[PDB]
Symmetry: C3
Subunit: 240 residues, 3 copies
C-alpha cells in the first residue's frame, strides 16, 4: 500500500547516494596516483583496468540511489523507478562485486562467480514480481544458486587468506565479514519481509537495504581499496 | 488461446531442466580435474576461464527451464514468464554458444560472431511481439543476419576441421550436425508456427523447442566437452 | 500526439539504414584485407578483435534503423518500437563508440569510459519516461555523468594527438569534431525538445537525430577506419 514515508526513504537514499558516490570518487582518485601508500607511480602510467571496478560500482550504486530518491521524492511509482522491480539493479552491481573480488585475490572460476551472482539475483527479480506459491520456488532456485556460490568461495578465500602478510589480512578479514556475513542477509530479509513471514515492514525493508549497500558497495569498496594499497606496497616497493 | 496443456509443457521443461543442468554440472566437474582423459592436472592449477563457458550455458539454460516450468505450473502468464516473449532468453545463451565454439576452435571474428547471433535473436524477439505484416520483416531482418552468419561459419569450420586428428574430428563433426543442422531449424519452425504458415501447433511449438535446446545446449555442450578432452589429450600429454 | 509524418520518418530511417549498414559492411571488408593502404596481410592471419568494433556498431546501428522504420511504417506504437523509449538503443551503441575510440588511441580508463557513457544514457532513458519536475533531475544526473566524461577525454585525446604523424592527425581531428562537437548536441536537443523548452518539434526531433547518428556512427566509423589505415601504414610497413 502506497502509504510509507517516501520523503524519509528518499532522504536516506540521497544521504547514502553522496556517501557511496563520494567514496567511489575517492577510491578512483586514490587509485590513479599510487600503487601503494608511498604513491608509487605506475611504471607504464595507467592503472590496471580491472582495479577501477571497485570505484565504478559505487558510482554505479550512487547513480542508482539518486534515481531511487527521485522515485521516492516524486511519490513512488515512477516510470523509471528502480524500486518497483527489486534486485533489478543488483543484477548490474552485485555480479561486478564478485568480479573485482575474484580479480583482487586472483580467485579462479571468475565467469562461474559472475554467473553465480547474476543468476542468483534474476531469481530474486522473478521472485518479487510473482505473487504466488512459486515465489519461493524462485527463491529456492535462487538459493540453489547462491548456496553453492557462498560455498567454494569460502574455500577459495581460505586457500589464499593464509598467503597474504598480516597487514593485508586485516582488511581481507574485514572484507570477508562484509562478504560472508552480510551478503547472506539479503535472502534472510526476503523470508521475513511482507513477501514471506511478514516481519520486515514494507517501509523498513528499504531502509535496512539502503544501509547494507553502503557496507556491500562503499565500505566493501573502501576495504578492497585499502587492501589493494597494502597488497601492492608489500609486493612492489618492498619485493616481499 | 490459454487452453494448451501447461502441466505437460511444464513437466517437459522440468525433465529437461534436470538433464541440461545435470549435464552442465558434469562438464564443469569434468573440466576442473583433467586437461584430457588422463585427467592431466592444469600446470598452473586453474582451468582456462573460456573453457567453463560450455557448462555455464547449460546451468544458464537449466535455470531458465526451471523458470519456464514455474510459468507453466502456475497456469501461464506469470509476471516473470520467460515464455511470453520468445527467444528472449536465447539472446543470453545462443550468443554464448558461438562464443565458446569460436573459443574452442580459435575461430576468428568472435565479436562479429557474438553480434551476429545477438542481433539475430533480437529480431526474433521483435518478430514475435509484433502481430502485423512487419513480423516477417523482422524475420527477414533476422534472416538477413543469420544467413551471413551461418555462411562463413561453414567456411571457418571447414578450414580447421582438416587440421584436427581423426579422433577429435568425430566429435566436431557431431558438433557441426548439431550446429549447422539444428540451428537452421529455429527459423523453420517460426515460418510454420501459428505466426506464419500455421502448421506447428501453439502447444507443440514449445515441446519441439524444449527438445532442441537439449541438442543445442546440453548435447552440444557434451560434444564440445568431449571434443576438448580429445583435443588436449592429443596435444598436451602426447605433444602431437 | 500521433500526427507526425511517420512515412517520412520511416523513409529517413530506411535511407540512413542502408548508408550506415553499408558503411559498416565496407569497413569490415576493408579491415580483413589490409593493415594499411598497401593491404598488408595480418601476419597471424586474423584482424584484431577490437578493430572490428567500428564496423559492428554501424551494422548494430543499421539493424536498429531498420526496426525504427518498421515502427514508423506501421504507424508507430509497435510492441518492439525502439522509438517509444528514447536513447534505449544508444545504451548499446554509444558505450561501444567510446570503447573502440579508447582502443584505437589506447586511451586509459576504458572501463570508466564505458560506464561514463553507459550511465549517461540510462539517465536519458529515465528522463524521457518520467514526465515530471524530476525529468531534468535525471538530465542533471545524466549531465553530471557526461560533463566529467567529456572532460578528461579532451585531456586524454590532446596528450596523444601530438604523437601521431600529420597524416594521421587529420582524420583524428575530424574524429574529434564528430566526437567533441556533435556528442554534446544530444543534450542540447533534449533541452529544446518538447520535453523542455519546446523548440524542437516532436517530428523534427527524430529527423535531426537520424542525421546525427550517421556522423556519430557511420561517418565516425569511417574516420576511425581511415585513421587506423593511416596509423598502421605509418607504423607497420614503414616502421616509423
Ligand atoms: C538512472 C541510472 C540507472 C543506471 C542503470 C539502469 C539499469 C536498470 C533498468 C531499470 C528499469 C526500470 C523499470 C521500472 C518500471 C516501473 C513501473 C512502475 O513504476 O509501475 C507502477 C506505476 C503505477 O503507479 P501509479 O499509476 O502511481 O499507481 C497509483 C495510482 N495513482 O505504473 C506506471 O507509472 C506506468 C509505467 C510507465 C511505463 C514504464 C516505463 C519503464 C521505463 C522503460 C525504460 C527501461 C528499459 C528496460 C529495457 C526493456 C524495455 C522494457
Ligand atoms: C530465473 C532465471 C532467469 C535468468 C535470466 C533472465 C533474463 C531474461 C529476462 C526475462 C524477462 C521476463 C519478462 C516477462 C513478462 C511477462 C508478461 C506477462 O506474462 O504478461 C501476461 C499477463 C496477462 O495474463 P493473465 O492476466 O493471466 O491473462 C489472462 C486473464 N486472466 O500479464 C501479467 O501477468 C502482468 C505482468 C506484470 C508485470 C510484468 C513484470 C515482468 C518482470 C520484470 C522483471 C524483468 C526486468 C526486465 C528489465 C527491463 C524492465 C522492464
Ligand atoms: C531489431 C534489432 C534490435 C537490436 C537490439 C535491441 C535492444 C533494445 C531493446 C528494445 C526494447 C523495445 C521495447 C519497446 C516497447 C514499446 C511499447 C509501445 O510501443 O507502447 C505503446 C503502444 C500503445 O500504442 P497504440 O495502442 O497504438 O495507441 C494508440 C491507440 N490506438 O502500446 C502497445 O502497443 C503495447 C505494447 C505491447 C507490449 C510491449 C512488448 C515489448 C517487446 C518485449 C521484448 C523486449 C524485451 C525487453 C527485456 C525486458 C522484458 C520487458
Ligand atoms: C550520487 C550522484 C551520482 C554519482 C556519480 C555522479 C558523477 C560522478 C563524477 C564522475 C565519475 C567518473 C567519470 C568517468 C569518466 C572519466 C574518466 C576518468 O575519471 O579518468 C580518470 C581521470 C584522471 O586520470 P589520470 O590517470 O590523471 O590521466 C592520465 C592518464 N594516465 O580523471 C580525471 O580526469 C578527473 C575527473 C575529470 C576531470 C574534469 C574536471 C572537471 C569536471 C567537472 C565537474 C562536474 C561535476 C561532477 C562532480 C564530480 C567530478 C569529480
Ligand atoms: C535446473 C535447476 C537450475 C540449474 C542450476 C542450479 C544450481 C547449480 C549448482 C551450482 C552451479 C555452479 C555454482 C557456481 C559458483 C561456484 C564456483 C565453482 O563451481 O567453482 C568450482 C569449484 C571447484 O573448483 P576446483 O578447481 O576444485 O578449486 C580449486 C581452485 N583451482 O566447485 C566446487 O567447489 C564444487 C561446487 C561447490 C562446492 C560446495 C559443496 C556444497 C554445495 C551445496 C549444494 C547445494 C545444492 C546445489 C546442487 C548442486 C551443487 C553441485
Ligand atoms: C540495414 C539492414 C540491417 C544491417 C545489417 C544486415 C546484415 C549485414 C550482413 C552481415 C553482417 C556481418 C555478419 C557477421 C557474421 C559473419 C562473420 C564475418 O563477417 O566474418 C568475416 C568473413 C571474412 O573473413 P576473412 O578474414 O576472409 O576469413 C578468413 C579467416 N581469417 O566474412 C565473410 O565471410 C564475408 C561475409 C559472409 C560470406 C557469405 C557470403 C554469402 C552471404 C549471403 C548474403 C545474405 C544477405 C546479406 C547481405 C550482406 C552480406 C555481406
Ligand atoms: C559502525 C560504524 C560504521 C560507520 C560508517 C563508516 C563511515 C566511513 C569511514 C570509513 C569506513 C571504512 C574504513 C575502512 C578502514 C580504512 C581506514 C584506514 O585506516 O585507512 C588507512 C588509509 O586508507 C584510507 O585513507 C581509507 C580511509 C578513507 C575513507 C574515506 C571515507 C569515505 C569517503 C567519503 C567521502 C565523501 C562522502 C560525502 C559526505 C557524506 C554525506 C552523508 C589504512 O591504513 P591504517 O590502518 O590507518 O594504517 C596507517 C598507516 N598506513
Ligand atoms: C537419439 C537419442 C538421443 C538421446 C539423448 C542423449 C542422452 C545423453 C547421452 C549422451 C549424449 C551425448 C554423448 C556424446 C558422445 C560422448 C559419449 C562418449 O563415449 O564419451 C566418452 C567419454 O566422455 C564422456 O564421458 C561423455 C559422456 C557423458 C555423458 C553424460 C550424460 C549427461 C549428464 C547427465 C547427468 C544428469 C542428468 C539427470 C537425469 C535425467 C533426468 C531426466 C568419449 O570417449 P569414447 O568415444 O567412449 O572413447 C572411449 C575411450 N576414450
Ligand atoms: C557535409 C556533407 C556530408 C555528406 C555525407 C557523407 C557521405 C559519405 C562520404 C564519405 C564521408 C566520410 C569520408 C571521410 C574521409 C575519407 C575519404 C578518403 O579520402 O579516404 C581515403 C581512402 O579511404 C576510403 O576509401 C574512405 C572513403 C570511403 C567511404 C565510402 C562511403 C561509405 C560507404 C557506403 C556504401 C553503401 C551505402 C549505400 C548507398 C546509400 C543509399 C542511401 C583516405 O585517403 P585520402 O585522404 O584520399 O589519400 C589518398 C591517398 N591515401
Ligand atoms: C556476525 C556477522 C557480521 C559475520 C558472521 C560471519 C563471520 C563470523 C565470518 C565471515 C568471514 C569469516 C572469516 C573468513 C576467513 C577466515 C580465514 C580462515 O583461515 C580462518 C577463519 C576466518 C577468519 C573466517 C572466520 C569467520 C568469519 C569472520
Ligand atoms: C540432417 C540434419 C540433421 C543435418 C543436415 C546438415 C548436415 C548434412 C551437415 C551439418 C554439418 C556438415 C559437415 C560440416 C563439416 C564438414 C567438413 C568438410 O571438410 C566436409 C563436409 C562436412 C563433413 C559437412 C558435411 C555436411 C554436414 C554433416
Ligand atoms: C534475406 C535472405 C537471406 C532470405 C532469408 C529470408 C527469407 C527466408 C524470408 C524473407 C520473407 C519471408 C516470407 C515472408 C512472409 C511469409 C508469409 C507467411 O504466412 C509464410 C512464410 C513467408 C512466405 C515467409 C517465408 C520466409 C521468407 C521468404
Ligand atoms: C563547430 C562544431 C561542429 C565543433 C565545435 C568543437 C570544435 C571547435 C572542437 C572539437 C575537437 C577540437 C579539437 C580537439 C583536439 C585538438 C588538439 C589540440 O592539440 C589543439 C586543439 C584541437 C585541434 C581541438 C580544437 C577544437 C576542436 C576542433
Ligand atoms: C549490493 C550487493 C550485493 C552483493 C547484494 C546481494 C544480494 C544477494 C546475493 C541476494 C540473494 C537472493 C537470494 C539468494 C534469493 C532471494 C533473492 C535475493 C536476490 C535476495
Ligand atoms: C539455444 C541455442 C540456439 C543457438 C538457438 C538459436 C536460434 C536461432 C539461431 C534463431 C534464429 C531466428 C531467425 C534467424 C529468424 C526468426 C527468429 C529466430 C530467433 C527463430
Ligand atoms: C549514437 C552515439 C552517440 C554517442 C550518442 C550519444 C548521446 C549522448 C552522449 C547523450 C547524452 C544525454 C545527456 C547527457 C543528458 C540527457 C540525455 C542524453 C542521453 C541526451
Amino acid at each position: 500500500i502506497n502509504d510509507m514515508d517516501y520523503p524519509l526513504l528518499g532522504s536516506i537514499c540521497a544521504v547514502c547516494c553522496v556517501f557511496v558516490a563520494g567514496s567511489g570518487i575517492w577510491m578512483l582518485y586514490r587509485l590513479d596516483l599510487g600503487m601503494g601508500y608511498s604513491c608509487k607511480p605506475y611504471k607504464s602510467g595507467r592503472a590496471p583496468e580491472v582495479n577501477s571496478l571497485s570505484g565504478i560500482i559505487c558510482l554505479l550504486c550512487g547513480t542508482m540511489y539518486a534515481a531511487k530518491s527521485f522515485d521516492f521524492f516524486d511519490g513512488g511509482g515512477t516510470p523509471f523507478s528502480l524500486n518497483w522491480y527489486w534486485y533489478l539493479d543488483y543484477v548490474f552491481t552485485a555480479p561486478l562485486l564478485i568480479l573485482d573480488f575474484a580479480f583482487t585475490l586472483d580467485l579462479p572460476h571468475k565467469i562461474r562467480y559472475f554467473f553465480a551472482v547474476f543468476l542468483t539475483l534474476w531469481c530474486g527479480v522473478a521472485a518479487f514480481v510473482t505473487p504466488s506459491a512459486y515465489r519461493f520456488a524462485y527463491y529456492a532456485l535462487g538459493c540453489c544458486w547462491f548456496t553453492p556460490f557462498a560455498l567454494s568461495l569460502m574455500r577459495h578465500v581460505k586457500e589464499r587468506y593464509l598467503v597474504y602478510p598480516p597487514k593485508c589480512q586485516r582488511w581481507l578479514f574485514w572484507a570477508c565479514v562484509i562478504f560472508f556475513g552480510f551478503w547472506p542477509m539479503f535472502p534472510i530479509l526476503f523470508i521475513f519481509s511482507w513477501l514471506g513471514t511478514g516481519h520486515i515492514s514494507q517501509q523498513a525493508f528499504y531502509i535496512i537495504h539502503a544501509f547494507l549497500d553502503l557496507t556491500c558497495k562503499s565500505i566493501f569498496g573502501i576495504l578492497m581499496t585499502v587492501f589493494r594499497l597494502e597488497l601492492e606496497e608489500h609486493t612492489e616497493v618492498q619485493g616481499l
